[model samples]
Target: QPIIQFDAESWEAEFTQEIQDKAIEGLESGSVLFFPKLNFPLLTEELKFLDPTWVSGNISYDPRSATLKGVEGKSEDLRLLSGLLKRYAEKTAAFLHLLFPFYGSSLKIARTSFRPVEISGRSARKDDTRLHVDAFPSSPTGGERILRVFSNINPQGKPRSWRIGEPFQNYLNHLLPQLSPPAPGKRFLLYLFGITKGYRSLYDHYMLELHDKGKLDLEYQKNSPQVAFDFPAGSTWIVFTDQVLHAVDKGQFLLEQTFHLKVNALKHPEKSPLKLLETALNKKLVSSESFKL
Candidate 1:
């Protein structure tokens, strides 16, 4: 199943162990946990952002540095936008913690982004219209799980549409044989030259290759078995982007927050891309000492 719908009367309602376990299993196994009634309210002043002219570029919020980028306006307006994003990040983090207490200690909050641009047309690599899993070229995750919470805030009442593709194992089986391991010293050279934040491990290399290859292959994209999902306005959804093969068909005016969860924190670590790849290749992908850096 591509999505598991939750119809609880309240987002704050307590979940039983069975419900929580099922939710966790669904997320880790490539299913989106969709809450159709969960809404993120916006102030009247913030409603201006629903229009495309309010911001020149995507608004990105970094909770760690308390910095807001990709926006320019009056001091008060900037402060308001930053505070709004920060509060959303906090709220999402709290909700996630409540839903999965086991991940609370291992989760590290990342960026909160407000996208106001339409996603229909873009360059091939930058184009999210094609099917691919989330993998960063400059910022390597070192096998961390990417958990994202997204809210569709389009005031025009348009839904955020997406295409969910085949299972991860099937995708890996189709692409892994075409990818070769990275050359020795390549990772070090990338870091030395500032190409990547850190040395990209073998696992990272394969993932990046898969991400690009999947996007560039027109035949695979056309023939891939997938299903379409539309998240209406005011609905929120959560998924592990790294594990799910998804593509944004079309959408605009969305709010998103990303969190990185350590692989060791997962209830089923073997289901992670790192472990699955290791098992498929029959070799270690990440070095024990690499995490120290």
Candidate 2:
């Protein structure tokens, strides 16, 4: 388990230092270590594409279930997320190898999937989401879950800054001062981050309630801890929460839906089907001049 320098680019030196410092802080303060701007791009577009429904702002008004999701492959939101998911998986595995090479098999054994969320923006229940963490005792615990990584996607046009509370602010509140204000444009990059899913008991340590695992929700599998993060119009975030307590924004994005991939953590934790797809992508993307690029 050798640590990668976690370096990004020439101008990202300070950002990289933040990564090192925060990683240390995470050890003492908590297990979750968030490394912003690792300089890696999220490449998610190769296999799964957007449902082509919601990105267009179809605005399906569902009054019964109080839920609103896309029709399916209707919008171009896939255009943004497709790239991020691909690369994040590769980076996640690399981090795991660096941190715990012996447990690669166990890490590879869990299931993986895209989790979708729907929330009522500008509604009364906006701030009512229960505080929770993703790591369950059913999955690996403590340092084991720490090896897993999740990236939060920031859509190009939608600008968001987390409203830090006193509790979490005390821990990472300094990040607020360093929070890099996002830019504006038709096409923009998002952020990828990690949270340590230390451990929790699925049967007894049920800390928080979640939406019924469904198309929008992650299906419960043996090794697969639930994939928990925000999914917005231009953003699809995957966070590693084997540790750290997480707070889901109560109400924000108008519509979001996650289509499942054949990601079986147990069957293919290290080099799962999704990993194969990503490898093919890296190969196709690697040109002779890539080093020069």
lDDT of candidate 1 over 126-181, digit per residue (tens): 67888898999998888888999999888888899999999888898888767787
Question: What ranges in model 2 sit over 4 Å off?
Answer: 1-31, 39-87, 99-106, 113-128, 135-148, 157-242, 250-293
The alpha-carbon lDDT assigned to residue 161 of candidate 2 equals: 25
Worst 10 residues of 2 by lDDT: 206-215
lDDT of candidate 1 vs native? 0.86
lDDT of 2 by residue, 79-196 (tens): 3343334334444455544533333354542322233233334121123232333323233221222333433343343322221111222212222233222234211121111121
* Model 1 residue 38 CA deviation in Å: 0.5
Could you report the Cα RMSD, in angstroms, for every candidate shown?
2.3, 18.8
Q: Judged by TM-score, which candidate is best?
A: 1
Q: Give residue 245's lDDT in candidate 1 (0 to 100).
A: 93
Clashes of each: 0, 39
